[PDB]
Amino acid sequence: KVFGRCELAAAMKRHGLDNYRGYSLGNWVCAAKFESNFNTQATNRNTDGSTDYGILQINSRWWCNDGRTPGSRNLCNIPCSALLSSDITASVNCAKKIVSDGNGMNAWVAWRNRCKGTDVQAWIRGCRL
Ligand SMILES: [Cl-]
Ligand SMILES: [Cl-]
Ligand code: NA
């Protein structure tokens, strides 16, 4: 499913992400825009052979099981395919664990390079929240 901007903001808000660990909603929408272009079915393969899954491009080396990343962990205890559903619950729950592990949203390279230090509130401007 390809979310609209405000549609995704509202779904993320319902799932507890607004100001989660101090990151306002615009940060999460901005990261999703540049990680996946709001597409829950996005996948991308990394050089080490792991794969990134879903709206927030969560990585199989640490966070989910895809049966093809030897030596990896499954810290969200989830098949990676669950992160591709039109229901973003699994992705949001796993993202909460990632952002809590000490490095904040810097875990998302696109957030660090394209959202951090920008006017992220612009990503939720005009939405009914
Ligand atoms: Cl915001
Ligand atoms: Cl932080
Ligand atoms: Na894994």
PDB file of C-alpha atoms and ligand atoms in Angstrom:
ATOM      1  CA  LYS A   1       0.000   0.000   0.000  1.00  0.00           C
ATOM      2  CA  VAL A   2       1.248   3.492  -0.867  1.00  0.00           C
ATOM      3  CA  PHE A   3       0.192   5.854   1.915  1.00  0.00           C
ATOM      4  CA  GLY A   4      -0.682   9.473   1.461  1.00  0.00           C
ATOM      5  CA  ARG A   5       1.274  11.912   3.603  1.00  0.00           C
ATOM      6  CA  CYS A   6      -1.540  12.827   6.029  1.00  0.00           C
ATOM      7  CA  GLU A   7      -2.961   9.304   5.983  1.00  0.00           C
ATOM      8  CA  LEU A   8       0.350   7.967   7.258  1.00  0.00           C
ATOM      9  CA  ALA A   9       0.761  10.760   9.825  1.00  0.00           C
ATOM     10  CA  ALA A  10      -2.640   9.845  11.273  1.00  0.00           C
ATOM     11  CA  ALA A  11      -1.848   6.117  11.318  1.00  0.00           C
ATOM     12  CA  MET A  12       1.496   6.754  13.026  1.00  0.00           C
ATOM     13  CA  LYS A  13      -0.183   9.057  15.537  1.00  0.00           C
ATOM     14  CA  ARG A  14      -2.763   6.398  16.413  1.00  0.00           C
ATOM     15  CA  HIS A  15       0.082   3.919  16.969  1.00  0.00           C
ATOM     16  CA  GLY A  16       1.848   6.114  19.540  1.00  0.00           C
ATOM     17  CA  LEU A  17       4.729   7.556  17.522  1.00  0.00           C
ATOM     18  CA  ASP A  18       4.069  11.289  18.048  1.00  0.00           C
ATOM     19  CA  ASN A  19       6.798  12.455  20.464  1.00  0.00           C
ATOM     20  CA  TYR A  20       7.887   8.848  21.108  1.00  0.00           C
ATOM     21  CA  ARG A  21      11.302   9.143  22.815  1.00  0.00           C
ATOM     22  CA  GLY A  22      11.008  12.845  22.008  1.00  0.00           C
ATOM     23  CA  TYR A  23      10.704  12.570  18.203  1.00  0.00           C
ATOM     24  CA  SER A  24       7.759  14.600  16.941  1.00  0.00           C
ATOM     25  CA  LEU A  25       5.447  13.112  14.325  1.00  0.00           C
ATOM     26  CA  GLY A  26       7.037  15.025  11.452  1.00  0.00           C
ATOM     27  CA  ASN A  27      10.319  13.140  11.987  1.00  0.00           C
ATOM     28  CA  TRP A  28       8.664   9.766  11.427  1.00  0.00           C
ATOM     29  CA  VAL A  29       6.763  10.923   8.348  1.00  0.00           C
ATOM     30  CA  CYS A  30       9.918  12.477   6.892  1.00  0.00           C
ATOM     31  CA  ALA A  31      11.901   9.273   7.476  1.00  0.00           C
ATOM     32  CA  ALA A  32       9.177   7.149   5.875  1.00  0.00           C
ATOM     33  CA  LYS A  33       9.080   9.475   2.858  1.00  0.00           C
ATOM     34  CA  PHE A  34      12.769   9.121   2.140  1.00  0.00           C
ATOM     35  CA  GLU A  35      13.184   5.492   3.193  1.00  0.00           C
ATOM     36  CA  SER A  36      10.298   3.958   1.244  1.00  0.00           C
ATOM     37  CA  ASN A  37       8.356   6.774  -0.499  1.00  0.00           C
ATOM     38  CA  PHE A  38       5.433   5.769   1.760  1.00  0.00           C
ATOM     39  CA  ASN A  39       5.293   2.280   0.170  1.00  0.00           C
ATOM     40  CA  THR A  40       4.780  -0.563   2.641  1.00  0.00           C
ATOM     41  CA  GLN A  41       6.116  -3.070   0.079  1.00  0.00           C
ATOM     42  CA  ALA A  42       9.533  -1.425  -0.369  1.00  0.00           C
ATOM     43  CA  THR A  43      12.558  -3.709  -0.139  1.00  0.00           C
ATOM     44  CA  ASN A  44      16.233  -2.980  -0.712  1.00  0.00           C
ATOM     45  CA  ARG A  45      19.241  -5.264  -0.475  1.00  0.00           C
ATOM     46  CA  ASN A  46      22.403  -4.172   1.340  1.00  0.00           C
ATOM     47  CA  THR A  47      25.995  -4.957   0.424  1.00  0.00           C
ATOM     48  CA  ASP A  48      26.430  -7.359   3.360  1.00  0.00           C
ATOM     49  CA  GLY A  49      23.505  -9.448   2.077  1.00  0.00           C
ATOM     50  CA  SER A  50      20.923  -8.234   4.558  1.00  0.00           C
ATOM     51  CA  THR A  51      17.698  -6.643   3.324  1.00  0.00           C
ATOM     52  CA  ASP A  52      15.637  -3.603   4.434  1.00  0.00           C
ATOM     53  CA  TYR A  53      11.873  -4.085   4.656  1.00  0.00           C
ATOM     54  CA  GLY A  54       8.828  -1.879   4.586  1.00  0.00           C
ATOM     55  CA  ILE A  55       7.759   1.669   5.222  1.00  0.00           C
ATOM     56  CA  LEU A  56      10.726   2.305   7.553  1.00  0.00           C
ATOM     57  CA  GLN A  57      13.265   0.039   5.802  1.00  0.00           C
ATOM     58  CA  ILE A  58      13.964  -2.110   8.847  1.00  0.00           C
ATOM     59  CA  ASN A  59      17.089  -4.241   8.427  1.00  0.00           C
ATOM     60  CA  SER A  60      17.258  -8.047   8.550  1.00  0.00           C
ATOM     61  CA  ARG A  61      20.791  -8.056   9.994  1.00  0.00           C
ATOM     62  CA  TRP A  62      19.414  -7.136  13.437  1.00  0.00           C
ATOM     63  CA  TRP A  63      15.661  -6.761  13.595  1.00  0.00           C
ATOM     64  CA  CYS A  64      13.662  -9.414  11.713  1.00  0.00           C
ATOM     65  CA  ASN A  65      14.059 -12.900  10.294  1.00  0.00           C
ATOM     66  CA  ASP A  66      14.065 -13.437   6.526  1.00  0.00           C
ATOM     67  CA  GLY A  67      15.783 -16.842   6.445  1.00  0.00           C
ATOM     68  CA  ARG A  68      18.608 -15.564   4.246  1.00  0.00           C
ATOM     69  CA  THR A  69      20.811 -13.285   6.406  1.00  0.00           C
ATOM     70  CA  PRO A  70      23.286 -15.741   7.970  1.00  0.00           C
ATOM     71  CA  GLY A  71      24.435 -14.798  11.452  1.00  0.00           C
ATOM     72  CA  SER A  72      21.718 -12.203  11.947  1.00  0.00           C
ATOM     73  CA  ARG A  73      19.477 -11.489  14.895  1.00  0.00           C
ATOM     74  CA  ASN A  74      15.713 -11.185  15.094  1.00  0.00           C
ATOM     75  CA  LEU A  75      15.405  -8.567  17.809  1.00  0.00           C
ATOM     76  CA  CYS A  76      11.806  -7.627  16.949  1.00  0.00           C
ATOM     77  CA  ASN A  77      10.959 -11.367  16.874  1.00  0.00           C
ATOM     78  CA  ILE A  78       9.083 -11.121  13.603  1.00  0.00           C
ATOM     79  CA  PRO A  79       9.391 -12.443  10.036  1.00  0.00           C
ATOM     80  CA  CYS A  80      10.598  -9.581   7.859  1.00  0.00           C
ATOM     81  CA  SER A  81       7.625 -10.168   5.547  1.00  0.00           C
ATOM     82  CA  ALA A  82       5.338  -8.978   8.359  1.00  0.00           C
ATOM     83  CA  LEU A  83       6.888  -5.534   7.842  1.00  0.00           C
ATOM     84  CA  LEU A  84       5.438  -5.327   4.317  1.00  0.00           C
ATOM     85  CA  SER A  85       1.763  -5.438   5.329  1.00  0.00           C
ATOM     86  CA  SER A  86      -0.648  -2.590   4.636  1.00  0.00           C
ATOM     87  CA  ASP A  87      -1.161  -2.596   8.416  1.00  0.00           C
ATOM     88  CA  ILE A  88       1.845  -0.702   9.785  1.00  0.00           C
ATOM     89  CA  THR A  89       1.479  -2.060  13.324  1.00  0.00           C
ATOM     90  CA  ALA A  90       4.438  -4.446  13.102  1.00  0.00           C
ATOM     91  CA  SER A  91       6.707  -1.816  11.566  1.00  0.00           C
ATOM     92  CA  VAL A  92       5.778   0.757  14.199  1.00  0.00           C
ATOM     93  CA  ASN A  93       6.245  -1.637  17.105  1.00  0.00           C
ATOM     94  CA  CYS A  94       9.666  -2.664  15.817  1.00  0.00           C
ATOM     95  CA  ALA A  95      10.667   0.957  15.150  1.00  0.00           C
ATOM     96  CA  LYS A  96       9.869   1.807  18.770  1.00  0.00           C
ATOM     97  CA  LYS A  97      12.398  -0.827  19.841  1.00  0.00           C
ATOM     98  CA  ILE A  98      15.028   0.438  17.395  1.00  0.00           C
ATOM     99  CA  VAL A  99      14.717   4.080  18.399  1.00  0.00           C
ATOM    100  CA  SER A 100      15.057   3.033  22.056  1.00  0.00           C
ATOM    101  CA  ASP A 101      18.365   1.176  21.675  1.00  0.00           C
ATOM    102  CA  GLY A 102      20.570   4.235  22.355  1.00  0.00           C
ATOM    103  CA  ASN A 103      21.107   5.828  18.936  1.00  0.00           C
ATOM    104  CA  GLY A 104      17.674   7.343  18.476  1.00  0.00           C
ATOM    105  CA  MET A 105      16.547   7.965  14.916  1.00  0.00           C
ATOM    106  CA  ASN A 106      20.166   8.092  13.678  1.00  0.00           C
ATOM    107  CA  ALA A 107      19.622   4.372  12.999  1.00  0.00           C
ATOM    108  CA  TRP A 108      17.754   5.529   9.862  1.00  0.00           C
ATOM    109  CA  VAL A 109      20.394   6.828   7.453  1.00  0.00           C
ATOM    110  CA  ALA A 110      17.847   8.765   5.393  1.00  0.00           C
ATOM    111  CA  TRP A 111      16.535  10.477   8.506  1.00  0.00           C
ATOM    112  CA  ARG A 112      20.028  11.540   9.530  1.00  0.00           C
ATOM    113  CA  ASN A 113      20.902  12.803   6.066  1.00  0.00           C
ATOM    114  CA  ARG A 114      17.598  14.310   4.942  1.00  0.00           C
ATOM    115  CA  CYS A 115      15.374  15.069   7.958  1.00  0.00           C
ATOM    116  CA  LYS A 116      17.593  15.770  10.962  1.00  0.00           C
ATOM    117  CA  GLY A 117      17.915  19.507  11.513  1.00  0.00           C
ATOM    118  CA  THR A 118      15.231  20.403   8.952  1.00  0.00           C
ATOM    119  CA  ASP A 119      11.743  21.834   9.472  1.00  0.00           C
ATOM    120  CA  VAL A 120      10.166  18.424   9.973  1.00  0.00           C
ATOM    121  CA  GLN A 121       6.857  19.933  11.121  1.00  0.00           C
ATOM    122  CA  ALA A 122       6.246  20.727   7.436  1.00  0.00           C
ATOM    123  CA  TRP A 123       5.558  17.032   6.818  1.00  0.00           C
ATOM    124  CA  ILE A 124       2.350  17.137   8.873  1.00  0.00           C
ATOM    125  CA  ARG A 125       1.214  20.646   7.859  1.00  0.00           C
ATOM    126  CA  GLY A 126      -2.406  20.704   6.726  1.00  0.00           C
ATOM    127  CA  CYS A 127      -3.265  17.230   8.041  1.00  0.00           C
ATOM    128  CA  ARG A 128      -6.315  16.538  10.232  1.00  0.00           C
ATOM    129  CA  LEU A 129      -4.730  15.022  13.326  1.00  0.00           C
TER     130      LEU A 129
HETATM  131 CL    CL B   1       6.484  17.476  13.805  1.00  0.00          CL
HETATM  132 CL    CL B   2      17.422  10.463  21.068  1.00  0.00          CL
HETATM  133 NA    NA B   3      17.677 -11.457  10.901  1.00  0.00          NA
END
